[PDB]
Design a protein around this ligand. Sequence first.
Ligand SMILES: O=C(O)c1ccc(Cl)cc1
Ligand SMILES: O=C(O)c1ccc(Cl)cc1
Ligand SMILES: [Ca+2]
Ligand SMILES: [Ca+2]
Lengths: 502, 502
Amino acid sequence: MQTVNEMLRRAATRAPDHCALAVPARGLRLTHAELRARVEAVAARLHADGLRPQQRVAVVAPNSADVVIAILALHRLGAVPALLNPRLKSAELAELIKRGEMTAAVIAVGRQVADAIFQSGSGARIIFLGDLVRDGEPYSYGPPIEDPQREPAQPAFIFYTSTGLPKAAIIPQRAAESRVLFMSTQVGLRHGRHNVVLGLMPLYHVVGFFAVLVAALALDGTYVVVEEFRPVDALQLVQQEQVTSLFATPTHLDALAAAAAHAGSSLKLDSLRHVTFAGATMPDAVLETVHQHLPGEKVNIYGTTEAMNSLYMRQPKTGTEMAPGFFSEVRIVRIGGGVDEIVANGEEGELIVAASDSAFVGYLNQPQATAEKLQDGWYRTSDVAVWTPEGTVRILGRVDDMIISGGENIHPSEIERVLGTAPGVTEVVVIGLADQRWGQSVTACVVPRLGETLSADALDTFCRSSELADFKRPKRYFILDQLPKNALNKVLRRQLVQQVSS
Amino acid sequence: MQTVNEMLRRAATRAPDHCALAVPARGLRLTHAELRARVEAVAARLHADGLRPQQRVAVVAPNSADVVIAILALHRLGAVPALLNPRLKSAELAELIKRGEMTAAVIAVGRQVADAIFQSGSGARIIFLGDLVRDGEPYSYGPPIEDPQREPAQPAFIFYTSTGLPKAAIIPQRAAESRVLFMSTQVGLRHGRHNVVLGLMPLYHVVGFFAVLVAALALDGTYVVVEEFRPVDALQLVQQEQVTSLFATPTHLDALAAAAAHAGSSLKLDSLRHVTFAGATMPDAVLETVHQHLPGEKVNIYGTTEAMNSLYMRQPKTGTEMAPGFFSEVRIVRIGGGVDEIVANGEEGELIVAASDSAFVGYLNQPQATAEKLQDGWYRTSDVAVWTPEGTVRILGRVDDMIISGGENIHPSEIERVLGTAPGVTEVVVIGLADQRWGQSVTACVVPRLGETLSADALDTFCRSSELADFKRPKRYFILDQLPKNALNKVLRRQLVQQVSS
Ligand SMILES: O=C(O)c1ccc(Cl)cc1
Ligand SMILES: O=C(O)c1ccc(Cl)cc1
Ligand SMILES: [Ca+2]
Ligand SMILES: [Ca+2]
């Protein structure tokens, strides 16, 4: 195998004087060799402070060159970085660190987080990011340290998912290589000093780390740091840095397209060859503006924290239709059945994917959730899917979102995509409410565009004119001024049911 | 890891009804699933006959769909195929089989080879290819057999090299994946049913097997069988089969270019996107006609049986200047020195390459040769090279071909490339002959174009007009009617020294 460390180490022998890490706004640029020396220096300092191989270390920080250096240093020493979203509540961050039995936590200042960890009882030693490295410059002490022995199944990195608190997925050493190289076999990246990769995806997301940061460096290219997303600024970096690939959220992509659409603009996006996204939830309209206003090859991917890439589609026409690429083996099985209970073609079931080299080895300290998701060599996505007559996979939605009305499956995502194109609608969530037949009734919760007036009659008229089969059209509308959302701007579906029942 | 078997097995789950193997001339076409069933059937028959996992089996046959099925079947059963060039002398083939302690040999009729094996004393059981499978159709008997456990360092395939008899390089299970995927990271192939790969390279060559056959199937594409090379016919297959990539010898490429150069021709080569070659020995002129007359991206690669791909160059300008790609780590060391004796930049030494996942594990039954080539984690290529001011690798020639004159290194390959452009010259070999100073004198052996008259004076005049430094120009010419060559049309350099000394 080639671990993350080995891939970076080899890259550095091949292109030592080539730019590895750029933070243009900060005027900060490091070659592959300069980056490696800084990683080595931070590793040695961390070791001298008592940190040892296979100890878990939390990382709580937003994207920056300094966190890149810290993460890779932990890995170089042989510690296991547990990368956490810093936008989570402080008490939740502290509970996950406690839960995970971490040795230490590396955190970015604004330390109501450090307070939280202390007062949780965790005993994770706090390490401030600014104490380790500042704008690429490390605080250096301690003897040089051995590059430790890493084993294929051994914990390497921990990444956190979405009922309840996020789960700590353990990524083994052997998973890194295919988690990078799918970007070559599926997305068509290739080795070379031409690679300039824009860092839009968060580092605590598996795509942000493996598919973006590691792939950039491992292919002997440049990773461009973005500390704060702004569409005009991001497109200017494409031109100025000669960016060749970008991976972004559907939401960032809609904003980037709109910014690229001005005829009075001087922006040159010619260098950009690959625009990649996880577009299962992307509406036809968003995808259309992406095709129109951004250059490069568009590639849709399906993936998970647990198993990385499982499906993709070159030059997609809709976001939900994809097929397995290199590394992947997929099935669709009876919802709630064993891994060998293949559905007849055209029937709906749960998408499952083989757990090969790229797969997590379990959820840290959560044996119960692990047994439910990893069964008999297969990862269970908890997504509903169907094989089409063309032999591709159509993603239908989450098992848990599914609505059963008159004994028939209805997927709110489909109905939401339709209703989101209706006049006056700015937001829509489709949910099932209990009927009097022991089933559920398709119900739509809609927010009006500012100043517009919605009506159940007009919305139903729009649905009747759509392609929606009769049984799918909402039986009832709730017109609301806003939807209940958590701090991560995500809709609280349970809270919504309870709200509309009274 | 993903073995050859696993890569093919996964491909077959992904594209069972897509064409895997085509022999257009024969009207023979098999899907991935049809191919897999035939592999399984041949494996089961071979097992029932007594063949077991980890036993070595020689394969002596020219490219054909049937040998593809036999090789993969042996691998499926878990036996170790030892692939042999059928153009070698029968007695030499029998000696290698004996030397290798093979359990059996699968051979293509014209069995002066079977006679040879018997009368060698080998005790390898003879298996005729035509007894196993005929035009894709297997002779089926025996119970279904288990897919055996394969381990990363365990022998998988054996491939033979070039003093003395060819050596049996043992390729481990873990080597297969990077031996395929370099075609993605270096050459820019990607996963997909668009892949149609023309099978010009021999299956008993590592490129022919890993980079061509296995890569074709593993990426869910089609392998087009070519039993006998003919330029017009090969280009017609490009058009008719919509070939996307081809890997050929410099010699085949010169012939394909010439055939493509006709303005009266109806050939459409539009589908062809990748023309790949090992061009270290390719003259500037040949490369020029390749650029002019063949479409697709041209990529030069450097590789070995022992370590697969170590250097490459996109859109090459000369054949000798390349750089390490993904997977690779390279050094240039003091000729005859330890692996850490790095040369100062611009000084000549031996190219060595790290022995990572793709590397052989040794030469079967040849511990002495193994110790010379695999030292301290490094494979020794026995090629001389130098780092250029641009930081690329320039291949200079074989260590053993090097001529020392007045204490200075001269590489005949360089002098041969120059002299091959001289009027009247059809063939040239540059050799060193003993001088009276305990060194060697640069001597050129030249064959005239049919009917042309060569002279030492005219040849020396041409050299004086070239870019050759003074010390490199031949001191002496031998004008010969032909050069001594073995049955593989290769020049016998030792035999040439002895011939011209009398
Ligand atoms: O979580 C995701 O959406 C995700 C994870 C991994 C990949 Cl490759 C793609 C998407
Ligand atoms: O033997 C060769 O020339 C050779 C072997 C392997 C590769 Cl990848 C390229 C060339
Ligand atoms: Ca309100
Ligand atoms: Ca003669």
